[PDB]
Structure 1
């Protein structure tokens, strides 16, 4: 594997939730250890499981992994770091300012942005400690910082300017005032990230058009920033020696082969390695090492049942939520189609390009975001100096900015949810709704269980379910309780003779049980489609069927 050759002292793995960042991190950690190298694996996931895979406990202290000499680990819990980070800002003014005030500021430090900034504070610590390279040859991170976070800390304005405490725009700039290291260390860290002699960035992806799109995006952003030592690792690829008998496995192998060959242009000139889809979720040194080789039904109702229940009231705001790529848009489309075929007036709204009983409102997120950014600039940038304006423009470059702008656009038609059905394929986070509420926002409507039905879409996989769970908890803090969960891309409810797909379908079981037993009131299982759910044809196939009853 090219990504394994000549790794510099700092190695970072980046990619969407569930692509396999941690697995590959551990497997690489082992490979290096067995070569006689001293390796430090840095676990950075919210609910770390690296200790589990290695059959021991790890913590905020560097401890050796007894089950593999040469390797040690360290956990950097991001939720805890965020907590301490927020508390380090608020505790000082606690008792000096009103409670509602300290309460509002605390909320401003409870979003994904504060977490990335606090996580960057930790990365900076490790990256600027030369002594570490005195003890190890390699330091491996199972997540990487975003281009957004790096930009923010490299902006001069972030150091010489300050932005008022308004309701819009700079909403997420609050964390900056929390940095306690000197400006020079953060710049040094970024310097270390941009040095190919010190840091190698590995983009983890899967052979899917949608995912490669995102990865290609990340690559460009991190490169313009200065990280040009990038490697592409395509994980979980299906071996042709499985497309043999079964028809689904053959359709999949085909879908991957097209993409694999039609890789986005930007990723083409990138050194690339592919890993194979393993039978069982790696859990030991043996299983993990096997990953780096060069050679190879649940009792849950169909989407149809969920929709029949959504259909009872005969109207309502239906919002699909979840992480990027889980299938929000497809479920939104599938739901809107079935509801319409049941004879109801349905208004589907989307933020992506794709009978008369159904109307579709397409919104371009790019222009909504710009209308928004433009608005926040006439409002706040008014008295900012140029450096500060750039800081404000980078803050309005946050994920949540688009999220907010698109919701505001949708809100234009939310008033129709009273007479009929309005289905949305994306929504802001709990944190963001709470923020907007303090500012416009139909908060009460979203919180009403009879008017709004929020659905959480996820995958029958560990990380996705975890991230889904956390989204839900955040929404609940905003008084919104998801009405049901949709587990998309399931091999369990799929027709396959392929021995490997069956072994994979069996891996989902504990994840699916998790959702039913601990995360959701209602659940729907959608199959991994043998085709691209692009036509209303295959879109109707996703739903399955629901037997009428009284």
Structure 2
């Protein structure tokens, strides 16, 4: 693998939940420890499972991995780090400022943004500890900071400005400005840091990764490698329509990578029949050469949704899980059964009217607004700090939700279906200053969580649900999209993967959701009403 060659001391893997960052990191560590290198594997995930893969426990203390001489591990808990970040700022004012005030300040430090800043504080400590490179040849991280977090920390305004906002976290920066600048130099130095962009052969993901590449390079991280994971080996595309349609779909994408990633050294890793749970399994991942559950169809959820003839239906979930596709499929079925439906989308690509809002224009409107509102009196460094804060992922969600709010009032006379929604955290924040009760009322609004029959994706969906719950919003149901167990295939590899889904689909059924739907992988893309209708399955 090109990414495995002459690696600098710091190795970072970035990419969406479940693309394979941790798996690839563990396999990389083993491989390097076996070449005689001293390796430190830094587990960064919220519910770390790294200990599991090595069949041993690991904590916030460096420990050698008994089963792999040369390798040690360290777990940095992000939820714990944000918690302490929050406590450092809030504890001094408890019993001082009135309870509602403290509670408001506390909520401002409970979003994904505070968690990212806290994670960076953790990354910074490791990146600045020169002693580490005295004991280790390489330190591998299974996540990486975002361009947004890095830009925030490099802005002069962050160290001299006082102003829905996510800058509250800044107040908690543990270290001196010099250490963060140092950490940033370490990240931008190709002789010290290598960044691996992990992706899947799917047109959508590739575009997101392309964007990530441009943001990080723009900041100075130009030592980047592209690793395409889970690729279907051609062999499997023999004697099977799905495996062939899939193999065909990835191939097109593989041969038509987005221009921005074309010049990057690219390696591909084949799809494995079993979720790697040991060293042999892990190491097999770097190789250069190669029955159903009892869950209702989407039709079923839609059937129960139709019951009251109207209402607000909101599809939520992480990026790329299928919110827009599911929302489309829901609106089509409702419309097809005589109900009045109004579908709203943020993605540019009768008795059913569709509204498309342009995220960019809404964001910019909303941005212009918060700028004249909170920007006055701020010097220029302060305005740039504020502008960068308006570059958080939540800024867009707020702006788009803002726009969808125009037609959310129609949920009273018909069905309004939205393909995206803000977080519970953001909702709470917006409600501090918006139709909160509407969203909280179980009748009027039905929140659907879209996810995948995979480990990380399920955990991420569960965390999004816990957060909505804090905001008094209970998800009405869960939709497990792209399932193989529900799809028909004779491909042994595929059926093997379908089997790997069972545990995840089970944890959703008996722990996360009351109402659950299973949607099959359709191969290609459900772009036409036909395909869209095919996802639902039949009545009764």
State the TM-score bracket (shorter-chain normalisation): over 0.9
- RMSD across aligned C-alpha pairs, in angstroms? 0.9
Contact 1:203 1:230 in 2 (8 A): yes
Secondary structure (helix, strand or coil) at the match of 1:298 reads coil
How far apart are the structure 2 equivalents of 1:189 and 1:121? Answer: 10
Query: For 1:355-395, what per-residue CA distance to the aligned partner results, in whole angstroms no more than 9, with x for missing partners?
Result: x1100000000000000000001111111000000000000
- 1:385 maps to 379
**Aligned residue in 1 for 2:146:** 146
Per-residue deviation, residues 489-531 of structure 1 (Å, max 9, x unmatched): 0000001000000000000000000000000010000000033
Distance (whole Å) between structure 1 residues aligned to residue 96 and residue 429 of structure 2: 23
Q: Which runs of 5+ in 2 are unaligned?
A: none
Is residue 19–residue 205 contact of structure 1 (8 Å, CA) maintained in 2?
yes
Report how far residue 315 of structure 1 moved. Answer: 0.4
Instruction: Please tell me whether the aligned partners of residues 349 and 363 of structure 1 are also in contact (alpha carbons under 8 angstroms).
Output: yes
Superposition deviation, residue 161 in structure 1: 1.2
Q: Shift of residue 304 of structure 1?
A: 0.2
Aligned counterparts of 1:450 and 1:458: Cα–Cα separation in 2: 23
Residue 247 of structure 1: CA displacement? 0.8
Confirm or deny: 8 A CA contact 2:249 2:523 kept in the other structure: no
Question: Residues of 1 paired with 2:174 and 2:31: CA distance?
Answer: 37
CA contact under 8 A between 1:33 and 1:70: conserved in structure 2? yes
Give the secondary-structure state (helix, strand or coil) at the position aligned to 1:295: coil
Q: For 1:367, what is the secondary structure of its paired residue?
A: helix
Paired residues in the alignment total 539
The whole-number CA distance in structure 1 between the counterparts of 2:391 and 2:399 is 12
Is the 1:531–1:538 contact (alpha carbons within 8 Å) kept by the matching residues of 2? no
User: Is residue 203–residue 219 contact of structure 1 (8 Å, CA) maintained in 2?
Assistant: yes
- Check whether the contact 2:465–2:475 (CA below 8 A) recurs between aligned residues: yes
Matched position secondary structure for 2:229: strand
Give the distance between the partners of 2:475 and 2:461, measured in 1 at CA.
Answer: 11
> What residue is the counterpart of 2:320 in the other structure?
325
Secondary structure of the structure 1 residue equivalent to 2:13: strand
Secondary structure of the residue aligned to 1:223 is: helix
CA distance in 2, matches of 1:503, 1:462: 16
Deviation at 1:486, TM superposition (A): 0.3
8 Å CA contact 2:300–2:539 kept in 1: the answer is no
- For residue 353 of structure 1, report the CA deviation from its aligned partner: 1.8
Structure 1 CA distance for aligned equivalents of residues 504 and 161 of structure 2: 47
Q: Does 1:260 align with 2:254?
A: yes
- Residue of structure 1 in register with 2:464 after alignment: 471
Match of 2:265 in 1: 271
1:142-200 per-residue CA deviation (whole Å, 9 max, x = no partner) reads 0000000000000000001111xxxxxx6100000100210000000000000000000
**In 1, Cα distance between equivalents of 2:528 and 2:221:** 40
Q: What do residues 207-258 of structure 1 show as CA deviations (whole Å, max 9, x unaligned)? A: 0000000000000000000000000000000000000011100000000000
> Once the 2 structures are TM-superposed, how far is the Cα of residue 549 of structure 1 from its aligned partner?
9.5
SS at match of 2:234: coil
SS in 2 for 1:333: helix
Secondary structure class of the residue paired with 2:114 = helix
Could you tell me how far apart the structure 2 residues matched to 1:180 and 1:318 are?
42
CA distance in 2, matches of 1:436, 1:531: 39
Is the partner of 1:171 in helix, strand or coil? coil
TM-score (norm 2): 0.99
Q: Does structure 2 retain, via aligned residues, the 8 Å contact 1:192–1:199?
A: yes
Contact 1:526 1:542 in 2 (8 A): yes
> Does the 8 Å CA contact 1:3/1:273 hold for their aligned counterparts?
yes
How many Å separate the matches in 2 of 1:441 and 1:28?
48
Q: Describe the SS at the equivalent of 1:380.
A: helix
Q: Deviations over 1:458-513 (max 9, x none)?
A: 00000000000000000000000000000000000001000000000000000000
Does the residue aligned with 1:534 lie in a helix, a strand or coil? coil
- The alpha carbon displacement at 1:92 in A equals 1.1
Tell me the equivalent position of 1:299. Answer: 294
CA distance in 1, matches of 2:174, 2:229: 38
TM-score by structure 1 length?
0.97
SS of the aligned residue for 2:236 comes to: coil
Question: 1:33-56: CA deviations, max 9, x gaps?
Answer: 000000000000000000000000
SS state at 1:318 partner: strand
